[PDB]
Design an enzyme around this catalytic site. Sequence first.
Site, PDB file in Angstrom:
ATOM      1  N   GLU A 207       0.817  -1.197   0.000  1.00 43.93           N
ATOM      2  CA  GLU A 207       0.000   0.000   0.000  1.00 43.93           C
ATOM      3  C   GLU A 207       0.861   1.261   0.000  1.00 43.93           C
ATOM      4  O   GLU A 207       0.535   2.227  -0.687  1.00 43.93           O
ATOM      5  CB  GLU A 207      -0.985  -0.075   1.172  1.00 43.93           C
ATOM      6  CG  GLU A 207      -2.195  -0.994   0.835  1.00 43.93           C
ATOM      7  CD  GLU A 207      -2.933  -0.543  -0.464  1.00 43.93           C
ATOM      8  OE1 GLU A 207      -3.565  -1.373  -1.180  1.00 43.93           O
ATOM      9  OE2 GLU A 207      -2.871   0.668  -0.773  1.00 43.93           O
TER      10      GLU A 207
ATOM     11  N   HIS B 276     -16.150  -5.860  -5.948  1.00 44.06           N
ATOM     12  CA  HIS B 276     -15.883  -5.062  -7.135  1.00 44.06           C
ATOM     13  C   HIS B 276     -17.045  -5.112  -8.102  1.00 44.06           C
ATOM     14  O   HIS B 276     -17.271  -4.153  -8.846  1.00 44.06           O
ATOM     15  CB  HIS B 276     -14.616  -5.547  -7.834  1.00 44.06           C
ATOM     16  CG  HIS B 276     -13.453  -5.745  -6.915  1.00 44.06           C
ATOM     17  ND1 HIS B 276     -13.485  -6.625  -5.851  1.00 44.06           N
ATOM     18  CD2 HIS B 276     -12.223  -5.182  -6.905  1.00 44.06           C
ATOM     19  CE1 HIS B 276     -12.325  -6.590  -5.224  1.00 44.06           C
ATOM     20  NE2 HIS B 276     -11.541  -5.725  -5.844  1.00 44.06           N
TER      21      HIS B 276
HETATM   22 ZN   LIG Z   1      -4.001  -2.096  -3.654  1.00 41.41          ZN
END
Ligand SMILES: [Zn+2]
Lengths: 198, 588
Positions: free
Chosen positions: B354, B484
């Site tokens: 991240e 998603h």
């Molecule tokens: Zn990611």
Amino acid sequence: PTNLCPFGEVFNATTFASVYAWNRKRISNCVADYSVLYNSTSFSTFKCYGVSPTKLNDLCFTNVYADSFVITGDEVRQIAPGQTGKIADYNYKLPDDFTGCVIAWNSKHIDAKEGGNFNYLYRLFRKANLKPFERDISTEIYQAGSKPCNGQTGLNCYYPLYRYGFYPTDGVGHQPYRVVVLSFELLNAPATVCGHHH
Amino acid sequence: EELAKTFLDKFNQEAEDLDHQRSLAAWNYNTNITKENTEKMNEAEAKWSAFYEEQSKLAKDYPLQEIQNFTLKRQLQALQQSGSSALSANKREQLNTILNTMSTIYSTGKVCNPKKPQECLLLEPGLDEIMANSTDYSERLWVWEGWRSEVGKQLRPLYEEYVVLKNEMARANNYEDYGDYWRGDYEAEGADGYGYNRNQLIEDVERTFAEIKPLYEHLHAYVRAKLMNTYPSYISPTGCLPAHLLGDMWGRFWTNLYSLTVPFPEKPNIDVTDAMINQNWNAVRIFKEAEKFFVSVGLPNMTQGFWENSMLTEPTDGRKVVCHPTAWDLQKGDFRIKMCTKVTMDNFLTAHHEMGHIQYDMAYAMQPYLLRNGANEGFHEAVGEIMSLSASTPKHLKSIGLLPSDFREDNETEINFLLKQALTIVGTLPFTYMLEKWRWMVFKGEIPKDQWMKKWWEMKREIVGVMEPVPHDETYCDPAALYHVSNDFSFIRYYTRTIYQFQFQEALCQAAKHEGPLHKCDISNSTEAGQKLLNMLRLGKSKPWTLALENVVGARNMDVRPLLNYFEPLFGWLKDQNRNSFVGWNTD
Ligand SMILES: [Zn+2]
Ligand SMILES: *[C@@H]1O[C@H](CO[C@@H]2O[C@@H](C)[C@@H](O)[C@@H](O)[C@@H]2O)[C@@H](O[C@@H]2O[C@H](CO)[C@@H](O[C@@H]3O[C@H](CO[C@H]4O[C@H](CO)[C@@H](O)[C@H](O)[C@@H]4O)[C@@H](O)[C@H](O)[C@@H]3O)[C@H](O)[C@H]2NC(C)=O)[C@H](O)[C@H]1NC(C)=O
Ligand SMILES: *[C@@H]1O[C@H](CO)[C@@H](O[C@@H]2O[C@H](CO)[C@@H](O)[C@H](O)[C@H]2NC(C)=O)[C@H](O)[C@H]1NC(C)=O
Ligand SMILES: *[C@@H]1O[C@H](CO)[C@@H](O)[C@H](O)[C@H]1NC(C)=O
Ligand SMILES: *[C@@H]1O[C@H](CO)[C@@H](O)[C@H](O)[C@H]1NC(C)=O
Ligand SMILES: *[C@@H]1O[C@H](CO)[C@@H](O)[C@H](O)[C@H]1NC(C)=O
Ligand SMILES: *[C@@H]1O[C@H](CO)[C@@H](O)[C@H](O)[C@H]1NC(C)=O
Ligand SMILES: [Cl-]
């Protein structure tokens, strides 16, 4: 010359000018300690062109001019001779022969606040670049096209001023900085703005 | 001439100023979930949508084919084409009501223990655990069938409406369907051999998948063998894996089958999580370490604001928070990461991932707002995994941290490592391609709504070698039950990301002069490899991705070979284990 140059008013001023509307003051018949300027660690930027700061305490000039506005940290590069970009082009242009000292310090503590502070402005657009030390507080509608504007914001017709939004969380390059440009002017005239050593 | 430019700077500055205000509103929600804080997001989420629709329409005033400077044309085309939901007033708001309702039905899902009816559980903390930790078939079956029953079925009518209005929206922007609109992300004009058309993509996806399939087939038969030990009588030796029996709630990653599939149990395990607990690592120190990784290759440190404005610890304020990890570009040099980071090896590894995204955000801020993005949607996730490839090697874990350095690194641990990798990385490739091949087909109309599930499960069985416990008629909407899908996110990115990873890490490691197996490569201390990667990040979307790829790997499309090379040792091993068994799957 006995009395003190009021650089203190310029630097410790509580209220500071938006940059397109930039404030100039003339400092004229006075003696200064410039050490109190350079010998100080508030100043992120302190660049001098044509003078060397340590000697400014020996040197008398005929006039010194103090221009002061607020700008983002990344833009403090634009306040320099031979520089380009929306500040250098449309709000504040120093001349290539500048002899003086840009001085800037971070002012997130005062000029940014939770929710944003929008009390500062700047000129995104102009028909032509500015002249050195040219000031322009117009609110006229920019027309880059052929069809004119009747104070009408639309296709190719944009209001020329935008607000800074300064937030405490902003990255350092987008935080507010207070800037102060000192021009040391040398005319074949008597010189009464002197450093601390005669 | 091109007054478009003088339009664009206006957009560039108004965009960031409001998107700044949108980001701040969203962040104040995600770290502090209030009725007040939820409402303020919608106001900013409203203003931004209203802001775009006018710029989209205003952009259309400027013709894209008068513009010569490709960098300026590329931004203009994005504005007039993308987000140009000039659909209809009653359909730009029906679609948004559909898009919130799906987003929140998923967020608010609760299914109940068929034997303990008042015991009902959300997915985000709870049901995820059963699906990562359980070996109780019937237990997993109700958690799996329940989520697909309780939330999926509610989402079915919405998906159908979602489909029409999205296909309409994409039609209006000169696209065959929403799928075409999505694939458009990989389109790039240079007219100099760096051009890429949308309809090359499905050919290049199906091309590379064909190269991946052997490896996947062998990883499948191996995992099937070790799983009949745990579920004899439910898994046939010759057939598909039950869908409820994999790493998680879908078969998305096979990571949590490692416990069950580890080739060499008797090798001492490699999991560094206990050493951190011993050593009193905490959230801060994990990121300080990932910072050292990047610094060491010559990337910048983090910003001071990143430290003060990020959320690393899940709050004990009673502040309720979305704990799912994300990396935020809030437009003003204000970078933050939002993660409930627990003291484990897997979190340590994701914090490297991240912070990969943050570096890529920092790297391209020199760009006009419209170009602050990854060269295609595949590039950002590729850039974060590149980090985990190096930081998960035993070589790295020794040096900076607490593998013991008395650690034996032989052919048996290397197979252990690769198998762990393949479960999460190679396992996801079929799962991801089969999902977009559904959606693409659904958007193209190749699948009637009366055969959505009929053709989903059939495709699952054919491509992922996965099958469903209970039979599902057209009242279910099983794909809608992945985040998603019901949150309207393009998905093929996780495939293209995966091939990019190995293209990068190969060329990057070669700049670090690493010798030997690509999979033991750690890039740390290589300013040479960092500069090589830092050049392309800086480019952002400002050049075609085909040109950006070559400026690193020296290629202009997906090449599977690095991925095959990376897993080459596990390939030979798997083929031996399977040598006198069946490789493949039945579809009954
Ligand atoms: Zn990611
Ligand atoms: C992020 O990292 C930067 C980069 O620092 C370098 O890289 C790291 C990885 C280490 O190797 C450091 O040792 C490197 O210096 C940090 O910036 C540096 O911060 C230090 C303070 O910790 C600065 O050192 C001081 O500089 C003073 C004078 O500053 C003026 O001159 C410098 C250099 O020309 C100029 O950058 C600055 O704008 C000023 O005009 C001086 O009084 C003091 O004695 C000491 O020398 C160092 O100069 C900084 N380097 C740069 C390039 O800015 C950041 O601190 C760090 N950020 C965070 C949040 O951790
Ligand atoms: C004003 O500041 C200057 C620096 O801007 C001071 O002089 C320099 O700083 C070092 C301190 O580490 C001194 O030891 C040196 O004499 C100077 N450096 C160099 C490279 O020559 C100066 O001392 C300050 N003014 C006063 C009156 O103290
Ligand atoms: C006001 O500014 C002047 C200019 O440097 C400085 O000398 C003075 O100390 C300031 N006043 C304070 C800090 O109270
Ligand atoms: C969350 O929002 C409420 C709304 O006023 C605020 O009072 C509270 O302090 C916020 N929490 C934090 C940690 O800021
Ligand atoms: C396009 O515009 C950019 C703006 O900086 C300029 O640098 C570039 O030379 C122009 N031409 C091309 C072909 O990119
Ligand atoms: C980086 O250099 C130090 C210097 O000794 C070394 O100990 C460390 O192991 C190196 N990093 C890696 C990943 O090997
Ligand atoms: Cl499913």
